[PDB]
Design a binder for this molecule. Structure first.
Ligand code: HEM
Ligand SMILES: c1ccc(-c2cnc[nH]2)cc1
Ligand SMILES: [Hg+2]
Ligand SMILES: [Hg+2]
Length: 397
C-alpha cells in the first residue's frame, strides 16, 4: 500500500469521449498510485479521489515552482507554460498576479462581453445557414467563436485574431514535440509587450488595460503582465475542443439534444453536468512537488516527490457523484475547471460561451443533426486536449 507498483501510462488515442481504460484501473487500485508517462524521467504519485485531489491542489505544501527543475515524468514532450508563468508560480507571487485580472473573469466581469459575443455568434451561425448544408460545425462556428470572444475580452483588435490563433497553434504545436525556435514562440510575447506597455495607456476595462494599469501602479512587472496575457490568450481556445465534445455527445444521443432544445430552463444545469462528465484531456497535465514530507491517506510522500491529480477521475468519484458514468441533468461540485489557487480563471467565460453556443445551435438551426455516424466523427490524435477534428452536420433547408 505504501509502495504501489509503477503503472506505465503510454500515449493512446481514445475514440470520441470514451473514458481511458488505464485511468479506470488506477481508480480501482486505491487512493494513491504511482505512474510513469511517456516523457520526462522516473515516476510520480497520482491521486484520484475527489477529497484527495482537493487537498493536493489546495495545500501550500505542494508547489508548482519546483516542478521545472526535475524532469518529472509527463505526457507532453515539452511544457507550454514558461518559467515564471502563473502555471509555475506559487503564492504569494501567484496570488498577486492572478488578482490583477480576477475581476474581469468573474460572472459580473464576463457579462461585459456577453451581448457582443452573442451578436458575433449569430453572425457565424447565420453565415453557415446561408451557405447551406452540409457543413463542419467546428470550422464554421466552434473554432472561430472562442477566438473572437477571448480577443474581445482581452482588448485585442479584431484584425489580429488570425495572427493570435496562428501564434497559439505554433506554441501548442511545440508542446507536441514540434521544433519551433524561441523566436517563433515569443511573437505573441512581443505583441502583448507592445499592447500592454505602449498602448492601452488610458483607462480601460478590458484585460490588457487592467494589466497595463497594474504595471503603472507598480503592482506587477511588464514581464509578469505579458506572461499572463499570453497564457489567457492560449487558454481561451479550449472551448473549441470542449464544446466540440459537447455537441458530438448531444447529437449522438438525439434524446438529450431534444431535452435541451425543448427545456430552456434546464440548460444551465445540463451544461454543468456535461462539463463534469466530458473527459477534456488525455492523462494528466502539470504535477506539483511535495515541498516537505507529507502523508495522504496514510501513504508517505517524501519531499521532492512529484504528485499528480486527475480532475477527470475526481469527477467520477462514486462517493461524490452516485452512478458517476451516468449523465444526469438533474444531478454537482465537479472540478473540470480545477481546484485551489490554480483553478481556471476562464471557467465563467467558458460557461458563458457554452451557454450561448447551446442556445444558438439548438434554437437557430432547423433540425440540426450529425451528417455521419457518431463513430465516424474523427477525433484529435496525439493531443493534450481531446476533441473532434471536424463535426459534419446538416439541417432542414
Ligand atoms: C471548458 C473550457 C476550459 C476547461 C475545461 C479548462 C480547464 C482548466 C484546468 C483543468 C486547468 C488546470 C488547473 C490546475 O493547474 O490545477 C486550467 C488552467 C488554466 N486555464 Fe483553463 N479551462 C477552460 C477554459 C479556459 C479559458 C477560456 C481560458 C482563458 C480565459 C483559460 C485559462 C486558463 C489559465 C490561464 C490557466 C492557468 C491558471 C493558473 O495556473 O493559475 N481556461 N484550465
Ligand atoms: C494544454 C493543457 C491545458 C490547456 C488549457 C487550460 N485552460 C485552457 N486551456 C491547454 C493546453
Ligand atoms: Hg484570440
Ligand atoms: Hg485543461
Amino acid at each position: 500500500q505504501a509502495v504501489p507498483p509503477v503503472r506505465d501510462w503510454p500515449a493512446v488515442d481514445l475514440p470520441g469521449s470514451d473514458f481511458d481504460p488505464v485511468l479506470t484501473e488506477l481508480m480501482r487500485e486505491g487512493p494513491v498510485t504511482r505512474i510513469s508517462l511517456p516523457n520526462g524521467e522516473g515516476w510520480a504519485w497520482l491521486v484520484t479521489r475527489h477529497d484527495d485531489v482537493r487537498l493536493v491542489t489546495n495545500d501550500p505544501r505542494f508547489g508548482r515552482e519546483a516542478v521545472m527543475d526535475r524532469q518529472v515524468t509527463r505526457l507532453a514532450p515539452h511544457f507550454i507554460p514558461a518559467r515564471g508563468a502563473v502555471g509555475f508560480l506559487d503564492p504569494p507571487d501567484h496570488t498577486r498576479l492572478r488578482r490583477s485580472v480576477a475581476a474581469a473573469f468573474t460572472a459580473r466581469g464576463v457579462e461585459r462581453v456577453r451581448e457582443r459575443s452573442r451578436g458575433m455568434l449569430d453572425e457565424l451561425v447565420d453565415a453557415m445557414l446561408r451557405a447551406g448544408p452540409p457543413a463542419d460545425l467546428t470550422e464554421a462556428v466552434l473554432s472561430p467563436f472562442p477566438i473572437a470572444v477571448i480577443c474581445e475580452l482581452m482588448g485585442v483588435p479584431a484584425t489580429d485574431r488570425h495572427s493570435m490563433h496562428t501564434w497559439t497553434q505554433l506554441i501548442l504545436s511545440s508542446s507536441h514535440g514540434a521544433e519551433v525556435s524561441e523566436r517563433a514562440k515569443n511573437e505573441m510575447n512581443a505583441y502583448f509587450s507592445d499592447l500592454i506597455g505602449l498602448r492601452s495607456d488610458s483607462a480601460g476595462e478590458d484585460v490588457t488595460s487592467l494589466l497595463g494599469a497594474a504595471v503603472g501602479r507598480d503592482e506587477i512587472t511588464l514581464s509578469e503582465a505579458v506572461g499572463l496575457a499570453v497564457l489567457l490568450q492560449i487558454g481561451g481556445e479550449a472551448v473549441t475542443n470542449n464544446s466540440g465534445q459537447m455537441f458530438h455527445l448531444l447529437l449522438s444521443r438525439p434524446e438529450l439534444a431534444e431535452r435541451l432544445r425543448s427545456e430552456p430552463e434546464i440548460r444551465p444545469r445540463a451544461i454543468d453536468e456535461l462539463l463534469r462528465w466530458i473527459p477534456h484531456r488525455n492523462a494528466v497535465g502539470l504535477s506539483r512537488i511535495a515541498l516537505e514530507d507529507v502523508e495522504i491517506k496514510g501513504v508517505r510522500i517524501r519531499a521532492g516527490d512529484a504528485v499528480y491529480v486527475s480532475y477527470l477521475a475526481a469527477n467520477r468519484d462514486p462517493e461524490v457523484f452516485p452512478d458517476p458514468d451516468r449523465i444526469d441533468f438533474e444531478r454537482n461540485p465537479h472540478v473540470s475547471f480545477g481546484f485551489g489557487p490554480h483553478y481556471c480563471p476562464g471557467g465563467m467565460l467558458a460557461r458563458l460561451e457554452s451557454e450561448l453556443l447551446v442556445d444558438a445551435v439548438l434554437d437557430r438551426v432547423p433540425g440540426l443533426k450529425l451528417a455521419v455516424a457518431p463513430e465516424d466523427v474523427p477525433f484529435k490524435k496525439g493531443a493534450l486536449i481531446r476533441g473532434p477534428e471536424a463535426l459534419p452536420v446538416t439541417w432542414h433547408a
